[PDB]
Symmetry: C6
Subunit: 242 residues, 6 copies
Amino acid sequence: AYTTAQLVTAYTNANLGKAPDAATTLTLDAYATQTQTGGLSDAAALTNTLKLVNSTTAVAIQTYQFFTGVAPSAAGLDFLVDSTTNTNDLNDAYYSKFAQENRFINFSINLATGAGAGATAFAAAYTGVSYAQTVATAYDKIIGNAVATAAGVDVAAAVAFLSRQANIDYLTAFVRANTPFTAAADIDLAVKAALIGTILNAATVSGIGGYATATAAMINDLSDGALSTDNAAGVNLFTAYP
Amino acid sequence: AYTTAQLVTAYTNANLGKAPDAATTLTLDAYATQTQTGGLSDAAALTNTLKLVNSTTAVAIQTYQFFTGVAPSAAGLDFLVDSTTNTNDLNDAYYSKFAQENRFINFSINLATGAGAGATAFAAAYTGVSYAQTVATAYDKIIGNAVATAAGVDVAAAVAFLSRQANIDYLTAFVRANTPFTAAADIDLAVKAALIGTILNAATVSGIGGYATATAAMINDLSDGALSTDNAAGVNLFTAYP
Amino acid sequence: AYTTAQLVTAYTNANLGKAPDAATTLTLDAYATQTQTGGLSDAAALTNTLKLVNSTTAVAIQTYQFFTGVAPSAAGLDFLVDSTTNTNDLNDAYYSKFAQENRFINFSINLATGAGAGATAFAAAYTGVSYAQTVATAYDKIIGNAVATAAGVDVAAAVAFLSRQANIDYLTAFVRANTPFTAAADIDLAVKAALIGTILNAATVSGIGGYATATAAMINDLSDGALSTDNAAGVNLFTAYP
Amino acid sequence: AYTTAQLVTAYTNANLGKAPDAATTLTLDAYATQTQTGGLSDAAALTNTLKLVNSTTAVAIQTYQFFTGVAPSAAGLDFLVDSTTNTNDLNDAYYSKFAQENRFINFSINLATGAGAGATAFAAAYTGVSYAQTVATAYDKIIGNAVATAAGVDVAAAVAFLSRQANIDYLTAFVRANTPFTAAADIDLAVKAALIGTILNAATVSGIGGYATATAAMINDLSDGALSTDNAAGVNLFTAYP
Amino acid sequence: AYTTAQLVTAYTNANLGKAPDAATTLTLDAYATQTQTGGLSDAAALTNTLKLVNSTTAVAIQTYQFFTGVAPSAAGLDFLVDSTTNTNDLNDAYYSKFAQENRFINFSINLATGAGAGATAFAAAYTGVSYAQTVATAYDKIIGNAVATAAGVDVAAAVAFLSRQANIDYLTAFVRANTPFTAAADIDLAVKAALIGTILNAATVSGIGGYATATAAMINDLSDGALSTDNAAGVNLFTAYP
Amino acid sequence: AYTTAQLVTAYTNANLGKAPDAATTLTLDAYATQTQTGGLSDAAALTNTLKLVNSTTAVAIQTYQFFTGVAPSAAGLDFLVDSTTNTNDLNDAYYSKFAQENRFINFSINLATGAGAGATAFAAAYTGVSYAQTVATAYDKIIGNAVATAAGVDVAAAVAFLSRQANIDYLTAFVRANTPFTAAADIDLAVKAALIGTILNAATVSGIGGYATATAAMINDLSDGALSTDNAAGVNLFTAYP
Ligand SMILES: CC(=O)N[C@H]1[C@H](O)[C@H](O)[C@@H](O[C@@H]2[C@H](O)[C@H](O[C@@H]3[C@H](O)[C@@H](O[C@@H]4[C@H](O)[C@@H](O[C@@H]5[C@H](O)[C@H](O[C@@H]6[C@H](O)[C@@H](O)O[C@H](C)[C@H]6NC(C)=O)O[C@H](CO)[C@H]5O)O[C@H](C)[C@H]4NC(C)=O)O[C@H](C)[C@H]3NC(C)=O)O[C@H](CO)[C@H]2O)O[C@@H]1C
Ligand SMILES: CC(=O)N[C@H]1[C@H](O)[C@H](O)[C@@H](O[C@@H]2[C@H](O)[C@H](O[C@@H]3[C@H](O)[C@@H](O[C@@H]4[C@H](O)[C@@H](O[C@@H]5[C@H](O)[C@H](O[C@@H]6[C@H](O)[C@@H](O)O[C@H](C)[C@H]6NC(C)=O)O[C@H](CO)[C@H]5O)O[C@H](C)[C@H]4NC(C)=O)O[C@H](C)[C@H]3NC(C)=O)O[C@H](CO)[C@H]2O)O[C@@H]1C
Ligand SMILES: CC(=O)N[C@H]1[C@H](O)[C@H](O)[C@@H](O[C@@H]2[C@H](O)[C@H](O[C@@H]3[C@H](O)[C@@H](O[C@@H]4[C@H](O)[C@@H](O[C@@H]5[C@H](O)[C@H](O[C@@H]6[C@H](O)[C@@H](O)O[C@H](C)[C@H]6NC(C)=O)O[C@H](CO)[C@H]5O)O[C@H](C)[C@H]4NC(C)=O)O[C@H](C)[C@H]3NC(C)=O)O[C@H](CO)[C@H]2O)O[C@@H]1C
Ligand SMILES: CC(=O)N[C@H]1[C@H](O)[C@H](O)[C@@H](O[C@@H]2[C@H](O)[C@H](O[C@@H]3[C@H](O)[C@@H](O[C@@H]4[C@H](O)[C@@H](O[C@@H]5[C@H](O)[C@H](O[C@@H]6[C@H](O)[C@@H](O)O[C@H](C)[C@H]6NC(C)=O)O[C@H](CO)[C@H]5O)O[C@H](C)[C@H]4NC(C)=O)O[C@H](C)[C@H]3NC(C)=O)O[C@H](CO)[C@H]2O)O[C@@H]1C
Ligand SMILES: CC(=O)N[C@H]1[C@H](O)[C@H](O)[C@@H](O[C@@H]2[C@H](O)[C@H](O[C@@H]3[C@H](O)[C@@H](O[C@@H]4[C@H](O)[C@@H](O[C@@H]5[C@H](O)[C@H](O[C@@H]6[C@H](O)[C@@H](O)O[C@H](C)[C@H]6NC(C)=O)O[C@H](CO)[C@H]5O)O[C@H](C)[C@H]4NC(C)=O)O[C@H](C)[C@H]3NC(C)=O)O[C@H](CO)[C@H]2O)O[C@@H]1C
Ligand SMILES: CC(=O)N[C@H]1[C@H](O)[C@H](O)[C@@H](O[C@@H]2[C@H](O)[C@H](O[C@@H]3[C@H](O)[C@@H](O[C@@H]4[C@H](O)[C@@H](O[C@@H]5[C@H](O)[C@H](O[C@@H]6[C@H](O)[C@@H](O)O[C@H](C)[C@H]6NC(C)=O)O[C@H](CO)[C@H]5O)O[C@H](C)[C@H]4NC(C)=O)O[C@H](C)[C@H]3NC(C)=O)O[C@H](CO)[C@H]2O)O[C@@H]1C
Ligand SMILES: CC(=O)N[C@H]1[C@H](O)[C@H](O)[C@@H](O[C@@H]2[C@H](O)[C@H](O[C@@H]3[C@H](O)[C@@H](O[C@@H]4[C@H](O)[C@@H](O[C@@H]5[C@H](O)[C@H](O[C@@H]6[C@H](O)[C@@H](O)O[C@H](C)[C@H]6NC(C)=O)O[C@H](CO)[C@H]5O)O[C@H](C)[C@H]4NC(C)=O)O[C@H](C)[C@H]3NC(C)=O)O[C@H](CO)[C@H]2O)O[C@@H]1C
Ligand SMILES: [Ca+2]
Ligand SMILES: [Ca+2]
Ligand SMILES: [Ca+2]
Ligand SMILES: [Ca+2]
Ligand SMILES: [Ca+2]
Ligand SMILES: [Ca+2]
Ligand SMILES: [Ca+2]
Ligand SMILES: [Ca+2]
Ligand SMILES: [Ca+2]
Ligand SMILES: [Ca+2]
Ligand SMILES: [Ca+2]
Ligand SMILES: [Ca+2]
Ligand SMILES: [Ca+2]
Ligand SMILES: [Ca+2]
Ligand SMILES: [Ca+2]
Ligand SMILES: [Ca+2]
Ligand SMILES: [Ca+2]
Ligand SMILES: [Ca+2]
């Protein structure tokens, strides 16, 4: 049985010191009532509670792991999500106008293009590759073909939907109108990051794939208040939480 | 085997001293015959007998528990349902023109708006929340998403039906024409109580959810004549009947 | 193996001394042949043999039990069905123009209206009750909601069919044109008896319900020639044959 | 393994000394080959061999059993089917123009009307009975309602088909144009025999019912050459072959 | 594992010294490869290898067995299929223009009409029999009604298809234009042989029936090079290979 | 768990010293990630890794085995796929314009026509055989009728599709416009090689058949770097890898 005070504290640690909104408080309150009435197990309530921090914390963990090869530390997560020194962070008015999918795309573009840490690695490996191939390889890397088929979703339809011309046209307009890029090569590279960022958003929403499971464990690890690993140079998701 | 005299006495205690109507007497008489003919078990007949007091007793128990956080005592139930000092109570001519759903809405509006005990708590928590969010959170709090899916009903369709624009338009007309409220904020808060009151009526009619099960046990506890707990400050449903 | 002589004697005792008709004799003869050829068990043949006395004996037993609260005795059954002192009885030319359903309605009207034994009790309990409620309560009392659903028949459709406006219009015309009643209250009470009488006919035709099972046992008890209980003041079906 | 010589001898005894036709010889020869090739068991071949004598021997056995109450003896069967003293018998040119169904009707009319042995018994029992009732009772007596439903055939459809107005119109034309009867009562009685005769033909063709099973055993008993019972006054099928 | 040299030698013995054609050699070569790759068992390859000799050897065995009552010997098979003294045999240019079905019909006509060994027996038994009866009896004799139903094919449809007016019109044209017969009786008898010959072709193509199984064993017996029985007066298929 | 360095080395040995392309590197990288995240077993990743060398290595192994009767050695594979002395090999700019199916056809034409090693054997066996027969025999030889049916694919539809007139018209145009052949016999022989080459491409794409399984084992054997057999005169696939 979870009290509403316990759930909001777990959410606060997962959200890194940010108090829940009034609407989210009612959702957390509903979860607490279900546990007391025998309608929801203790483990299920916590997982649902930690599922509300997807747009604010899971975006920071997953984008760094794919691009920079390592997830940010507790101090790095604190700076990115909710910090006093960072005026523009994930849960402030600067990002308040974005959705979950747009937030994933923004970090993907920033990391792979310009002054991002993984920008040089992204350009070397993702050059000379078509849009369809990038989607196909990223989908297998993030979610996986075997795992997705076992879960029930159709891989062939999902890959085609993500690589449709409508998605490409919208993303290239998003890159050109927003990013300070105008060359064909620079725009082409940035669209690839946007395509990958969409896949990352799809994986965390559905919860299927190695990336989605790994970031869930890290959020659960951070839920109690202190990260168990908390490595200074970053936490490798795949080896910290096998 | 239940005699018709036993069933009406159980109903009278559940209805708090009110004699059954002539139509309800035939329904109770039919239940007694089925038990004697081996067509209905003793436990099933009593549960069906206590299912006829939904509009007169279960409304008082459930509305107080959700809003004030505690169910009324035996003396409090007596005053609300059938008392000599209370000229206008649930089973008199004042409420004789209402249906089951309208009765649930009336207590919800009275408790959450004006001089209700839980009015101050309701305003603090349910401010800045949209209509769709209030329905979604209340449905999970009262009935529950996991329990409803297991029972067979579709949660997604049920929530959309309860939050349709037709329901909102009818409820806001009900609030404005009946309640002494004219400000946008006051009307908006009252409609939220009406939306929650509809959910409470849905839960007790279908019998799915923690609230429906809890109020059934309290009515069964009151059926014999004396409430087992009968706390002076109120009976907490979720801890008295786990 | 049942001989045709044995079957007609069992039918005669069930019909209370009335010899079977020529058409019914062939039906009884067919049952005897099936037992000798190994196509029908001994118990099944007797039950089918006793199923042909529904319109002449089961009508007397069931109507008295529902209205007067007790089934007629062996002497009472003899007077009602086939007696020398009673010029107008069930199996004579006076009732030869009626069907099974009409026979059930006639006793229901006679008992509940006028000089019937149960007329005073029927008026006290069945006053202020709508037609739909009377059908719903009688159907549960006679057949039962749980038993009917288990058997496979749809209760919701059956109740609506029995309470349709076409049935009410036919029955009120039957009451007004036949019974010596013209007041609204007297006609309304008589139609309720007709509605109940139709339900009794439905129960005995289909064989589902406590009433149908109980009257079958009494007919089987009377089949051998002498009733086992044969109480002077009447036989209570539900306690004599649990 | 049955040789073609053995099969024709079994058929000859079943047909009471009549040699098989050239077409029937090929059918018997085909049965013999199947047994030698392992495609048909010995018991199945004999039953199929004895199924070809339906129109010549099973008609004599079944009609007498239903009407006269006893099957003909071996000498009686010999006179009826194939005898030197009887110029007009079942397997001669006199009956060579009839089919299986017409042969059954002819004996039914002869036995129940005119100088038949069972004519007086048939008139006493089958007077005052409608056509539909006669078909319904005869079908239960010969085939049976329970047995037919278990086999898979629909009793309700079969009875209605046998009692259709087209069947009655054809049969009454058959009776009037052929039998020397013109009165309404005499024609009505003869049509009842024709209706029963059709049922007997249906039972032996399909092989369902006590009559069909009983006459099959008697033919099998006669197959070896000598009847085991061979009672002088007739063989009662239901007690000789339980 | 079968080598391509072994398969062609088995086919040569089955074909009685005739070397396989170039097209058939590839088919035999494909069977050998499948056994070496673990895609086909040794027994299955030999049965498929012996299934290619249907039009040249199984025609001689089956037609003699049905008509003359005995299959030809090894010397008789050698003369009929592939012999130096016989200029016109089954696998030469004389029969190179015929198909499998036409080859079966040719032997049936030759044996049952003219100077055939079984011509006198065929005329005595198959006189006075209609076309439909001949097809029905031959189908039961060759394939069998019980065996065909167990295999899954519909006997009623198959018999009607083989006895359709289109088949009769084609066969009677085949008989009249080819055979030196012009009388009605002679043509009628020859068409019956053609109808039976078609059934024999159907049985060996599908592989269902006692005849098809028996001739397969004899071909398998001849496959090694020397027939095990090799009776001088002929081999009776049904007793040599039970 | 496979590292991306291990997968590319396995692919390099399978591709015989050729470094993977940038697009293929991402595919190999995705396989490595899945193994580390527990979404793909070690054996499955290697098989998928070796499935990307179908167009460059499996074409050399399979075409030689079918036509020349033996697969090329490690030195022979090195010369054909990736060698310094061979300016025009499978993975250079000379073959960079072809697809997988066209590559299979090219070797089939070269080997069976002109100066190919198996040209003389192909002409001797595949002369006087129709197009439909060649497809039917090759399909059974390469994939097999029994194996294909067990896998689920329809053999009858597949053979008809491969032998359709549209396929023949395209292939004969391919032969005439490309190969230096103009005679009817030479073109006819070359089209047969093209038809077989298409079947080989179909077998390796679907992975069904003895040829597909055998060439997979040889590629797996070559994956570690050194071939286990490495016979100087060639490796017989069916006996080296049973
Ligand atoms: C392992 C670990 O724990 N490491 C930590 C360290 O130990 C240490 O504690 C600390 O570090 C930080 C961190 O590494 C930081 O990384 C940044 C960061 O990931 C990210 O930052 C953003 C960037 O500085 C910048 O913004 C603009 C802006 O997004 C703009 O986009 C427009 C615009 O918003 C408006 O017009 O709306 C449009 C729709 C929008 N367009 C799009 C496409 O979205 O776009 C431009 C061009 O893309 C972009 O430059 O400002 C943001 C506010 C900022 N975000 C946050 C949350 O702060 O990406 C950087 C590339 C990345 N830098 C490097 C280097 O990798 O870097 C600082 C140093 O600069 C470091 O101290 O934290 C570690 C995690
Ligand atoms: C724990 C426990 O056991 N406690 C008990 C105590 O120990 C003690 O024994 C005792 O207490 C009572 C009780 O707490 C009472 O609580 C009241 C009560 O819940 C409720 O009361 C109603 C209210 O006083 C009032 O009415 C009007 C009216 O409903 C009107 O609505 C119109 C109108 O009917 C007509 O026009 O038709 C329209 C369709 C209708 N509109 C709508 C929208 O329905 O609407 C106005 C505005 O909403 C409303 O004020 O009169 C009712 C007759 C009355 N109902 C009953 C059953 O009595 O709500 C009050 C807000 C609530 N008060 C407080 C405070 O919470 O309060 C009294 C003291 O006043 C107390 O003694 O019982 C405890 C249970
Ligand atoms: C426990 C036990 O065993 N008790 C027995 C006693 O110990 C004792 O042995 C003995 O008793 C009898 C019995 O109690 C009797 O009961 C009667 C009886 O149940 C019933 O009787 C009928 C009634 O007297 C009457 O008839 C008319 C008539 O039905 C008429 O209807 C018209 C008409 O037929 C024509 O126009 O066609 C129309 C279509 C039709 N209309 C309708 C609607 O059908 O309608 C009027 C008004 O309804 C009606 O009065 O005459 C009938 C012939 C008679 N039936 C039989 C079978 O006899 O109902 C009585 C109300 C009931 N009486 C009492 C009192 O309850 O009563 C006598 C004394 O009168 C008693 O000796 O048997 C016990 C079973
Ligand atoms: C256990 C359960 O749940 N059962 C239910 C079923 O599962 C099902 O859901 C529904 O099914 C029904 C049910 O089986 C039913 O049966 C009918 C019914 O019993 C009755 O129905 C009445 C009838 O159609 C009709 O009657 C007239 C009338 O009897 C008339 O007689 C006159 C008249 O009384 C007066 O003038 O006096 C005269 C002397 C008299 N003449 C006589 C007696 O000769 O005679 C005519 C024929 O000439 C007759 O049509 O109309 C009534 C309104 C109707 N009543 C109701 C309540 O509907 O009798 C039918 C013979 C009977 N049918 C069959 C078949 O048995 O059947 C329907 C058929 O669709 C079925 O759907 O409900 C169950 C409760
Ligand atoms: C127990 C036992 O074993 N008993 C045996 C005895 O011990 C003893 O061995 C011995 O007995 C016989 C037997 O009992 C016989 O029984 C006969 C017999 O069952 C049957 O006989 C037929 C009857 O005599 C008669 O014919 C005409 C004819 O059918 C005609 O019909 C016309 C006509 O054919 C033409 O116009 O075509 C029309 C389409 C056709 N119409 C129809 C409707 O079909 O119709 C008339 C009127 O119906 C009819 O009389 O002649 C037949 C040739 C004959 N059939 C045979 C097979 O012989 O029915 C008799 C009524 C019955 N008699 C008695 C008595 O029951 O009787 C003799 C004595 O007469 C007896 O020796 O065998 C015992 C079995
Ligand atoms: C048990 C055993 O092993 N016995 C063997 C012996 O021990 C001994 O070793 C030896 O015997 C042979 C064998 O018994 C032979 O039997 C023959 C044989 O079965 C068969 O022979 C055919 C017949 O002689 C004949 O031909 C014509 C021709 O078919 C013609 O048809 C035309 C024509 O082809 C053209 O116009 O095209 C048309 C489409 C075609 N029409 C049709 C309808 O097809 O039709 C006429 C009339 O039907 C026909 O006579 O010539 C054939 C070439 C020949 N076939 C072969 C394969 O040789 O049928 C004979 C009736 C049969 N004879 C007897 C007798 O039964 O007989 C010789 C002696 O003549 C004997 O030495 O082999 C035993 C098996
Ligand atoms: C068991 C083992 O390991 N053996 C090895 C040896 O031990 C030894 O190590 C070594 O041997 C080689 C090898 O045996 C070689 O075999 C060749 C080879 O299989 C193949 O070679 C091709 C051929 O020489 C040739 O080309 C043209 C060309 O393809 C042309 O096609 C046109 C053209 O490309 C353009 O116009 O586009 C068109 C679309 C196209 N048309 C079509 C239809 O595709 O077509 C003509 C006519 O078909 C053709 O001649 O040149 C190619 C570049 C070459 N391919 C490669 C990969 O090198 O087929 C030869 C017939 C075969 N030779 C013999 C002999 O069998 O032979 C050399 C000696 O010449 C030997 O040293 O390797 C062993 C495996
Ligand atoms: Ca913080
Ligand atoms: Ca901040
Ligand atoms: Ca932790
Ligand atoms: Ca009270
Ligand atoms: Ca009151
Ligand atoms: Ca209690
Ligand atoms: Ca009597
Ligand atoms: Ca009387
Ligand atoms: Ca008794
Ligand atoms: Ca005889
Ligand atoms: Ca005779
Ligand atoms: Ca016997
Ligand atoms: Ca030879
Ligand atoms: Ca020859
Ligand atoms: Ca052998
Ligand atoms: Ca190399
Ligand atoms: Ca090269
Ligand atoms: Ca190796």
